[PDB]
Amino acid sequence: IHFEPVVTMEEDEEVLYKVRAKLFRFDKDAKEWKERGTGDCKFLKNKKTNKVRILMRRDKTLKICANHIIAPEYTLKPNVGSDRSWVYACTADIAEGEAEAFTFAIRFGSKENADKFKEEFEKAQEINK
Amino acid sequence: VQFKLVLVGDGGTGKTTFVKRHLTGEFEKKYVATLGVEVHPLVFHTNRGPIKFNVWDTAGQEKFGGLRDGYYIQAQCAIIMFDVTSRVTYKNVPNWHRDLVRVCENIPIVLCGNKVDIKDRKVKAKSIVFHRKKNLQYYDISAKSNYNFEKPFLWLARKLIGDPNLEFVAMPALAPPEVVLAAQYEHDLEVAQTTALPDEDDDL
Amino acid sequence: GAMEGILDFSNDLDIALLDQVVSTFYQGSGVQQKQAQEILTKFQDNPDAWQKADQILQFSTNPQSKFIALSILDKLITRKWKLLPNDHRIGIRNFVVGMIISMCQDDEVFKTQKNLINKSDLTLVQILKQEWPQNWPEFIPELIGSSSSSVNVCENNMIVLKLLSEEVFDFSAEQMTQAKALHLKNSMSKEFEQIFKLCFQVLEQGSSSSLIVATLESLLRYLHWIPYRYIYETNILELLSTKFMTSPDTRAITLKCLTEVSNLKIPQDNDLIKRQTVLFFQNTLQQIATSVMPVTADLKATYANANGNDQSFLQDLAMFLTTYLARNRALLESDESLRELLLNAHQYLIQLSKIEERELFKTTLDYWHNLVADLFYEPLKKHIYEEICSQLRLVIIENMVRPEEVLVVENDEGEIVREFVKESDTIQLYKSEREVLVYLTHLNVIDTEEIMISKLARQIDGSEWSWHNINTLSWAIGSISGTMSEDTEKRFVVTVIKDLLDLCVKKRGKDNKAVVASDIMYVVGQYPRFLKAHWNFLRTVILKLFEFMHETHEGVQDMACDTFIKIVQKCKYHFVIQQPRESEPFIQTIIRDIQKTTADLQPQQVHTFYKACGIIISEERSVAERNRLLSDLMQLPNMAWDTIVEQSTANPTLLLDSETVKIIANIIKTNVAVCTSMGADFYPQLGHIYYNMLQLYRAVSSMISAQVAAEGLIATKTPKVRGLRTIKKEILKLVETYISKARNLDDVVKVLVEPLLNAVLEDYMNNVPDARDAEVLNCMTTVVEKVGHMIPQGVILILQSVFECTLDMINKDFTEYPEHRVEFYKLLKVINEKSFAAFLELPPAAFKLFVDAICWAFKHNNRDVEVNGLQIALDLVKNIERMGNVPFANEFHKNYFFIFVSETFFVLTDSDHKSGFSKQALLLMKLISLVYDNKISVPLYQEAEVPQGTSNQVYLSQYLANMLSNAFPHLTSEQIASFLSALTKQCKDLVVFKGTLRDFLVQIKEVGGDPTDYLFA
Ligand SMILES: Nc1nc2c(ncn2[C@@H]2O[C@H](COP(=O)(O)OP(=O)(O)NP(=O)(O)O)[C@@H](O)[C@H]2O)c(=O)[nH]1
Ligand SMILES: [Cl-]
């Protein structure tokens, strides 16, 4: 006699790389960088299509601050003020809903982290090719 | 569905900066005084579904007060702000609270002591007791360092939905497009590269 | 757009359009809502908008429209009432009263339009503040009379009376003159006997209705001020503590009332009143136990569930019990028939203290502090509370929060990480918990030890193992250092450290190890008395910290370095002596192995290590031995320095790659760290590097200027130039640090100062603004502070080099160059304090700029700057007065006395500098008292404007009267005259002078202020 007992959309992706970062977007009108979020930047590879995107969420709120394919045509360039950041143009990011173009800057805790990011970024671009 | 939140407090306490941080992620360093009120929708994803706050960010400067307590009508929750580096802003908390509860008699209210990132703190933790008899929730916050920045909205969401176990959750991450106007001109990039990132001494 | 129509006052107001604009604002969104808002604000702010109010109130079908109509009237009543002709005042009163009566008589409106009614009531109270009782003597009798005619009206009258009491007693201090506040308080007091009669009657004849709640809400406000006889000589306490506690509708407000009763001013020699105070508490506690929850209830769980109003109730219960017991527990402590009541009340507090809610915990903890501090001193009391205190030990021990020293924490992924930010809130909570646990330990040291040891047992065997449990216990163990005997402590600490060390070896993984390591470090750092008595233990502990400096966890490394410092501050003697059965002092071993020990530390951590060595070395007071220790300590940075100085001077420069700049910065930072702990003892090391360091400062400065010239101002943002500026900043910091602690000031003056000024001053002056380091100003402030009196010509040089050029950086707005701003006024303050003669040597045009700069400072909202500006002004006036009757002082007054008076008045009265009120008032009083006391020996007036022989007293009053008349044209001449008469008569009594200034600040916000207000006491 057994007694009757008491009654994200990232699921199909692999994490290739994760790093803590601060993301900025450039305001051309104001001519200034504006913070978009701080948290883990992940490179996620779709298991079916093998395509690699950047997905970044803010600490605590978990809100998306970056969501775009690591396009082969993108290039990481240095910012004049920093040895631990990269700037690049993105033509289709959907963090805020509708596809929108941005000039991003992403900054890391150290030059080493920035350099490892660049390596992983360009690897992801090759996978996407 | 949605809840009206009124944000009140002295001029310069960081009300608009706090809201902007939540809206866009940015930290506005400039003080541009709010004129009357600025209304902003703000959505959080929780384990009980999305919650939308309609944030009425009111003016703290008397000269720019606009409709004053007229903004409070039909508010369902509130945040009262002060600046822990300015004693006068804490002195004025009972005045904001008086004006607010006279219009909104039984709403959940968070009291926030902002700018706790600043070294020379003037309103010490032990001085802050006004919330006790008024049944206000209290948090030390910093819009600059983001210390406790989520807590006021989490507490209000728990009170408004009536679920103490409610938590923020990761919003759905839809697949992003591919976008290969072939000869588009981006000297915009050189401007961006040659404009220094702010706060280069921060940890990040 | 169509919405703008309501702004055209030439046409009759279209009420339907107004209602549309209002609906769009409140219920709409986006651009249309924004447009509507702006239009409503313009409408409201139109000075004739109040003429529409009656029409809007009569014709509108939108409650918000009517609310806005009342706001418009509120603005008129509170600022311009006395300008209106009398029939408009009678008219506004009449229709506000009529609207309220009308709304109350319609049951449907009374139920559904509470916001509008409450707003109408507040508007009536604004009229009462202007008119009552002098032009409305029958208000209270008619209010009482009307209350019997209708329950809605009676209820609404309680709202009106509540709001009146608030405005008169709770919020009058800032909003009314002293005279008007006193007039209204006296007026309410004279009619309260009949207000109370009505209140008590309503309370007697009902149970839990909306009328009863409204009445109790009014009573809550009355309890702030009414005489105790209304509470103790009536049956009101019985009603509050029995009847109104039974019904949940009335329970919340009644509990708040009983909390305020517990604060009434009450005779202390009266056995009857003491019985009544006991009885209401007994009744209230019985009602809680029977109607709400028994003493045994799990309040932690109840609060967590957050049903209905349970959280607010438990908060309010905490406030009631803590308030009453802190005042009255002695009434319950002697009578054996009251013991159960006393202990039950405390048992509810114990249960409340288990609730997971930080702010509520702080409230209960404050009470526990009050209790245990009393039990510590008061004879024969602690035994009463022995069971309460034993439970409290457990509660505190189980809920200890993270001390400042514990630099590891668990993130949201459950990973042990280095703390991102210091938590001032939790730091203060830890200290509060420590204070209470320290008292509790003293009250029963055996109980405390037994609780901690039995908990420790369940961590070793794994039965209660968790990060939370090992952390709280370890923090508690560390927190009670000092409470045990040396022998009991010895056995205790030995056991704890032994078991924690065993736990560290036993548990697996980087996370577990980091947690236990942090706990070991917290505990050892808290028991220096033990370590000092036990060298072999101390030595082993230090070797353990050195092991932690090799861990891959940066938080553990950080804490190891900080703990090293914390131990060394207390135990340094034992590192300097040669200990029995050792071959050398441990400091020599430490220094020899420093490269090995610090190999895996980041630079900042290495500097902390050197700082700790500096603390130890300054324990050696024999100079030859100490200087040799210092030389030994600095061998590595000095060797690195010598080769960089060779490189830099043999190849100047074209050799400052980024790595070299980092090396140089870290050498200087190492020197700063050691100088911080050694202070005056650092001089020989400073001497070793000084001249080459200043040469390096010059070389770095040249490179920075060259980079800016070749690359633009943007160069200052580059890693290269930021790195070079770090070198300059750290050099300035080293010199500042040394001079701030120097004991031989003669050497500072003869050896250090001239080369410093030569190296830094022209460089600062001759760089572009974006390349100037604020740290130069900071360094000079310390130079002037410490040796300014010995270098008058050096102080003049400092002024010449930094004054005009820094002023020009900061005088275009209040925001640019924030650090220069702050350091500039700190420097001017110290020069004005210590070397005033330097200002006397300025040419008149420059001295004018100095006065300009001071006045500029007190217009800042930035507190740092504002406060220094007001202080420099006060100090300057005192400096001038100290000179007596001499040309410079006479000319100062003729040129600047009225500038200082007017500028001080401006910031006092502009409503944008309220934080500086006290210092503004002090400055104004000083200025006025100079004339009052005939301390200005020349006429302040020009020969033409006033009859010769006219006193400065008469001219000052004339000048001020004219100034105020033009600045505040809405004041009558009599207001201005009376204000100035009072202010001048009161210039030797700051508290009263300030009161008169506050009265003036109230009067300038309205029309028709009573000039006799300035005769107040
Ligand atoms: N250091 C620090 N500064 C802050 C913080 N939050 C805001 N500030 C600063 O404080 C200033 C005033 O901010 P703002 O948000 O405009 O204040 P407000 O309360 O909206 N003013 P108003 O009522 O007049 O509209 C800004 O310069 C902003 O950068 C903080 O957490 N820390
Ligand atoms: Cl302050």
Ligand SMILES: [Cl-]
């Ligand atoms: Cl309304």
Ligand SMILES: [Cl-]
């Ligand atoms: Cl010692």
Ligand SMILES: [Cl-]
């Ligand atoms: Cl007059």
Ligand SMILES: [Mg+2]
């Ligand atoms: Mg604002």
